[PDB]
Point group: C3
Chain length 153, copies 3
């Protein structure tokens, strides 16, 4: 029936004396992500993908003072539903030279799935290095990409 797709992008700088929080998971590391919120690059990209699929604009059009990125993802889900859409699936990729994200991925999926009220099998998170190329390759920031499918019920 009335399916729509959305895509999302984010990047934040890695800076000293900040926690690294990705997909709502705190990952031990000497740097963390810089942003007005908690700088959760993965959650921001997915949020942008969901708004894009519902044609609701973007994260900066909607947004909460001191709200963490999970609260913002939950509010995104609310606004998507308000517009008449159900979320069908989310897929994503984190690009980080370091640290190793592998043992944290299923926790990020579980977080996203709880926040969006989706079963686990409709949420995916992937990881890639940047083969030491560019600012990502030098560990100067972390990027996330996201894709979402929604349907107007």
């Amino acid at each position: 029936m009335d399916f729509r797709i959305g895509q999302g992008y984010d990047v934040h700088q890695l800076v000293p004396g900040r926690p690294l929080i990705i997909g709502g998971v705190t990952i031990p590391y000497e740097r963390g992500l810089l942003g007005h919120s908690d700088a959760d690059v993965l959650l921001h990209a997915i949020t942008d993908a969901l708004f894009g699929a519902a044609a609701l604009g973007d994260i900066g059009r909607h947004f909460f003072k001191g709200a963490d990125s999970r609260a913002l993802l939950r509010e995104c889900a609310s606004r998507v539903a308000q517009a008449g859409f159900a979320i069908r699936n989310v897929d994503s990729t984190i690009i980080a030279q370091a640290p190793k994200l592998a043992p944290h991925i299923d926790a990020m999926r579980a977080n996203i799935a709880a926040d969006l009220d989706l079963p686990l099998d409709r949420v995916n998170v992937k990881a890639k290095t940047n083969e030491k190329l560019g600012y990502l390759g030098r560990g100067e920031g972390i990027e996330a990409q996201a894709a979402a499918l929604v349907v107007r019920e």
Copy 2:
């Protein structure tokens, strides 16, 4: 039903002495995007996403720069011809989403007009077209304001 997705990417350098044209909107700015056409990075990304969804190749296959008419070509006219070819191949467009990444200028006040242009060229209602804007958080050539990037996604149905 026979749904298909497409994705697109574009980037152009930002240089003095060119109009800044994104999503068909001329934006007051002291630099513009460099290309053989009007260099409309957002429209090119969306055009690639539509050709891609329809499995019709890419924008360079359809609109060759070896043609003089490509010089300063209106990227909305290219987008409309793309949509016509996608329709001719048997596909209806269901939605478009996109992202522009630019350090500057401020895009927010032009976004709704970009969306209106795309919706007009694709013969869609506004509510099936979306345009998002991002900085690159000061990282890389984008953070240095050397170019502007666009990303796009499209869903069509045969």
Copy 3:
């Protein structure tokens, strides 16, 4: 019915001493992609989009094999999870060499490996307008999107 989308990304450094293999096609060139196996940046991105659509994690969690064998095993896993592939679209970003003449060859390799009609597979090419490590010819990037349906 029960459609799902996936997206994929990959990048490899481009250097002398290795052949250039993209979309299973060997392309004549002074340099080639550095990676564990054949460094096939396009097949890797597409494999990731397929696993992503099926919510099966990623290429590194699943896997001498060449990237086409990996793509085939990926399709089989996607199939076993209950999904049929509807279509694939992709973009290679390479400042050089010229990729247009090899596009049908890549599409044909990908289509064969996924058991898809040729008209459900698309590959596009872009330069990076001389910006960044891609624009300087230091690497090649690929991006992929896949649509599947749970049958």
